[PDB]
Design a protein around this ligand. Structure first.
Ligand SMILES: Cc1ccncc1NC(=O)Cc1cccc(I)c1
Ligand SMILES: Cc1ccncc1NC(=O)Cc1cccc(I)c1
Lengths: 304, 304
């Protein structure tokens, strides 16, 4: 019973958080095995940030300039290298709390949990989605850079995001753990406007299936539609076009509820065209798009 | 930048989760020091649940009937006792992962994080509020009983909730860690309807302050009100009456934003009377009441 915006248990990630200081800048690092991963802008001063030449800035840095602290103990830095927009600090000690892990570059529409950190210490955990415009709508303040996004499959943590910056519009941009930004964003204090933040249609349908499973059914109607007819409505409302891959991914939810994907699309079509009329769905007065079909199945089945 | 429904990092609690089995029932336990805490209905069969006599059922149970497993290793049970609606299983080993902790009985309107577990394994973490009718709107399936609610102050975990049951209305009831239910609920499969779920007014105002801090200001108006005038509106909309204690608790948010509490009440009054007119606040189309004034300050300052 019930449906919540649920994050993964953060323990395995908390054991990887460290504090990295270079000069006067302190941010978060991720310690996995004998490597600490952190945003390369840790080497920048506020003045450098307008147009930084990271290769030139990094020349003036030695291993001893990178202060890495895990809890209250200091890690010895024996190597440093820049991989895209991340720094990799080789330390002399493997993290004893290193979980089984992978680095994954997620697709827009996919969700993940963020462990927001400051000075290497966890402050909280929440669930995010990579927006179709490659931004994330997070909760981060100065000092949160280096906080990571991740998913967990039983005992394996798949790291997918590392926080780097806030855009002037209050949305967030970052990289995968290879240091490549999601989207066109660059790690410099410059005019970087975000593209259209469209709604993740397959996720809204998954959340509608979750609502039916949990008893909220008022929005079910007597109608059906086609992918092409639905997509005309989706375009008008800045929803992502629905494909047969999306319909296929909703198959288990359609099978569990007995509601054909195209019938659910027709409920969504009427919801887009007529609104909620002051009503709610799973305690929300808008269509929620940050639950994937996998999230709905996981939460509705209790995968640990 | 940004505002999210954030849970505490769950690591300290994950290290306390164990599986408790008695006969054919398996649920979650909380292992702190040499004691495992779990819902006493672990001793019940589905038939017992209609009208169980826990004292009589517990007579037929010995220490060896309580199977306690921490990960893949078995704990030896050397004692058992019933305290209200919880069982306390004394084990021969102190939990080496026991964090600094307290047991607290929270007040309605207060928030906490839940680590949903199944078979002693964490599935996810989310933020809840104890509703004014003493229910929680969680996400729990069969096997989740014994999952706990908690708050964290730096290194101290204050446990406040232990999940016991789902009401026929899909809302959740449970106990504090002394086994006393929140509200009038009893641990038996019987007609237990919930009272009026009123809105936590002080929390909605705190969330309105969070919105102003984060840039969402469209709802600020040219009006003010009084506590008595505001409370006439609050009664009409099933909002909790606002007191001077609530105004005092909003003091830091009022000081940070420069918006007097009664002016914010007048914005809330107009929002209640006229609705959002298709607009959103912090990505929500309804007034959010599961952020306390302390939560807003914590999130907006980055307390770790
Ligand atoms: C202040 C804040 C809030 C949330 N998340 C991150 C930050 N920090 C920054 O963005 C600092 C910064 C400034 C300009 C460019 C770059 I690269 C980094
Ligand atoms: C099925 C479920 C879903 C969510 N949270 C908890 C549960 N489990 C129960 O409530 C089992 C139960 C039944 C009747 C009385 C009692 I005491 C306990």
């Amino acid at each position: 019973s019930g449906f919540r915006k649920m994050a993964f248990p953060s323990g395995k990630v908390e054991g990887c958080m460290v504090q990295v200081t270079c000069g006067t800048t302190t941010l978060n690092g991720l310690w996995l095995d004998d490597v600490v991963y952190c945003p390369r802008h840790v080497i920048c001063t506020s003045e450098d940030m307008l147009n930084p030449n990271y290769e030139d800035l990094l020349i003036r840095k030695s291993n001893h300039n990178f202060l890495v602290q895990a809890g209250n103990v200091q890690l010895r830095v024996i190597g440093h290298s820049m991989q895209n927009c991340v720094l990799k600090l080789k330390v002399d000690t493997a993290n004893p709390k290193t979980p089984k892990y992978k680095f994954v570059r997620i697709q827009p529409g996919q969700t993940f949990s963020v462990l927001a950190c400051y000075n290497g210490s966890p402050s909280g955990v929440y669930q995010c989605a990579m927006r179709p415009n490659f931004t994330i709508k997070g909760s981060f303040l100065n000092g949160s850079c280096g906080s990571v996004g991740f998913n967990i499959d039983y005992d394996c943590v798949s790291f997918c995001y590392m926080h780097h910056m806030e855009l002037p519009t209050g949305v967030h941009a970052g990289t995968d753990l290879e240091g490549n930004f999601y989207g066109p964003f660059v790690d410099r204090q410059t005019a970087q406007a975000a593209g259209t933040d469209t709604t993740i249609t397959v996720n809204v349908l998954a959340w509608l299936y979750a609502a039916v499973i949990n008893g909220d059914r008022w929005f079910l109607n007597r109608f059906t539609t086609t992918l092409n007819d639905f997509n005309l409505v989706a375009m008008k409302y800045n929803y992502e076009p629905l494909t047969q891959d999306h319909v296929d991914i909703l198959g288990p939810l359609s099978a569990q509820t007995g509601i054909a994907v195209l019938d659910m699309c027709a409920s969504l079509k009427e919801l887009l065209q007529n609104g909620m009329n002051g009503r709610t769905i799973l305690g929300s007065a808008l269509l929620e798009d940050e639950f994937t079909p996998f999230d709905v199945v996981r939460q509705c089945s209790g995968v640990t």
